[PDB]
């Protein structure tokens, strides 16, 4: 249930998501979680919640639920803190917040640096997302000087496309390789091209937004929704799991990581239920034939960034 990584760790293939998990009930949440066998927690600083998460981390080690080591904890560096000299403050409030001394895993959470300041998205007067100078070149170096201080255990990116990994794979004097890299991934929007070169690499993915994100604020009616896909109904009644197994299950089976998130009990349980069955070599390509090169995941306010991953083909 793990994959090795370029580090020589291993990573369970499934985690639990919390992006829109509301910090009154994330806590209980990640309880649940941990109880009924998730062992990976993807975190941000960005969802204002690692506070509530790390209370949770914290309870099931102190109740010896698991232990420290049999945990994989992610957490991301937001965009204002790209700077060279902000990086490890920033790393250093994540793990304060989550009470933990280390990461086991902690991304660029996208190619793109803003402006420095307690605004996550600091805006000019007509709306375009104020840069920082920035490259990821130095932004690398010093998530490399994290792992050299023990901060963290591995490193990685999200979001970045493959010219953008290949800027890292080829960084002079490169230290420590990007170990994951994280991108929006599901039947919709399939991304051969990216995982292909990030695995020729020997750079485990993590698939994102897996079922959609269908509680992402932006939705709008028009939006299809992967969890109605008539189609991925019929594929999951054939094996008696749900729609959102089945959904859950596809990453796997391409050697991918995987985090949905929930704050449902009934529904972490669930989703969690999915090493009990296999999709079919047919099922897999079948699902990667729906692929709509349709992305729910960016922002029309960061289009103009030097570094916006998405204007190029993969
Ligand atoms: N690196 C990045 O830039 C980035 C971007 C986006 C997401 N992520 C990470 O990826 C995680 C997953 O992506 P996501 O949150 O965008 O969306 P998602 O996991 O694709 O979708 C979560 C939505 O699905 C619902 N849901 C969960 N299990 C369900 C089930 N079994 N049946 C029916 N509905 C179910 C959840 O409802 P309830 O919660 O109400 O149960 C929530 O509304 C995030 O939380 C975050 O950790 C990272
Ligand atoms: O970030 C998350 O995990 C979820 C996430 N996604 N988005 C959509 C985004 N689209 C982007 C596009 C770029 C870009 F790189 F393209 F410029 C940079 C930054 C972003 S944020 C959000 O606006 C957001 C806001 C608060 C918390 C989480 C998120």
């Given at each position: 249930?793990?994959?090795?990584?370029?580090?020589?760790?291993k990573?369970?293939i499934?985690g639990?998501?919390?992006w829109?998990?509301?910090?009154?009930?994330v806590?209980?949440?990640?309880?649940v979680?941990?109880?009924?066998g998730?062992?990976?927690?993807?975190?941000?600083?960005?969802y204002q919640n690692?506070?509530?998460?790390?209370?949770?981390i914290?309870?099931?080690?102190?109740?010896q639920?698991?232990?420290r080591?049999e945990?994989?904890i992610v957490?991301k560096?937001?965009?204002?803190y790209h700077?060279?000299?902000?990086?490890?403050?920033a790393?250093?409030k994540?793990?304060?917040?989550?009470?933990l001394?280390?990461?086991?895993?902690?991304?660029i959470?996208?190619?793109?640096?803003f402006?420095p300041?307690?605004?996550?998205?600091?805006?000019?007067?007509?709306?375009?997302?104020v840069?920082?100078?920035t490259n990821?070149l130095?932004t690398?170096?010093?998530m490399?000087?994290?792992?050299?201080?023990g901060?963290?255990?591995?490193?990685?990116?999200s979001?970045?496309?493959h010219?953008?990994?290949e800027?890292?794979?080829?960084?002079?004097?490169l230290?420590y390789?990007?170990?994951?890299?994280?991108i929006?991934?599901?039947p919709?929007?399939?991304?051969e091209?990216?995982?292909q070169?990030?695995?020729?690499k020997?750079?485990?993915?993590?698939a994102?937004?897996?079922?959609?994100?269908?509680?992402?604020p932006?939705?709008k009616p028009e939006?299809?929704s992967?969890l109605?896909?008539?189609?991925?109904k019929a594929?999951?009644?054939?094996h008696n799991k749900?729609?959102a197994?089945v959904?859950?299950?596809?990453?796997?089976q391409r050697?991918?990581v995987?985090?949905?998130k929930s704050?449902?009990?009934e529904r972490?349980?669930?989703?969690?239920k999915?090493f009990?069955?296999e999709?079919?070599?047919?099922?897999?390509?079948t699902?990667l034939?729906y692929?709509?090169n349709?992305?729910?995941?960016?922002l029309?306010?960061?289009?103009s960034?030097?570094?916006?991953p998405?204007?190029?083909?993969?």
């Amino acid at each position: 249930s793990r994959i090795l990584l370029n580090n020589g760790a291993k990573m369970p293939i499934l985690g639990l998501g919390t992006w829109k998990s509301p910090p009154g009930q994330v806590t209980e949440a990640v309880k649940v979680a941990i109880d009924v066998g998730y062992r990976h927690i993807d975190c941000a600083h960005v969802y204002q919640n690692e506070n509530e998460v790390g209370v949770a981390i914290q309870e099931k080690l102190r109740e010896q639920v698991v232990k420290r080591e049999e945990l994989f904890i992610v957490s991301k560096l937001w965009c204002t803190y790209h700077e060279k000299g902000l990086v490890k403050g920033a790393c250093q409030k994540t793990l304060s917040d989550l009470k933990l001394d280390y990461l086991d895993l902690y991304l660029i959470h996208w190619p793109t640096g803003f402006k420095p300041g307690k605004e996550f998205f600091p805006l000019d007067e007509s709306g375009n997302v104020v840069p920082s100078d920035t490259n990821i070149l130095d932004t690398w170096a010093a998530m490399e000087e994290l792992v050299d201080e023990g901060l963290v255990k591995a490193i990685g990116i999200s979001n970045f496309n493959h010219l953008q990994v290949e800027m890292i794979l080829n960084k002079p004097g490169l230290k420590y390789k990007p170990a994951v890299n994280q991108i929006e991934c599901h039947p919709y929007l399939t991304q051969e091209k990216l995982i292909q070169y990030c695995q020729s690499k020997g750079i485990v993915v993590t698939a994102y937004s897996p079922l959609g994100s269908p509680d992402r604020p932006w939705a709008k009616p028009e939006d299809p929704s992967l969890l109605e896909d008539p189609r991925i109904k019929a594929i999951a009644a054939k094996h008696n799991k749900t729609t959102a197994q089945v959904l859950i299950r596809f990453p796997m089976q391409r050697n991918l990581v995987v985090i949905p998130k929930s704050v449902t009990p009934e529904r972490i349980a669930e989703n969690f239920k999915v090493f009990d069955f296999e999709l079919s070599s047919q099922d897999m390509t079948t699902l990667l034939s729906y692929n709509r090169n349709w992305r729910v995941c960016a922002l029309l306010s960061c289009t103009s960034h030097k570094d916006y991953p998405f204007h190029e083909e993969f």
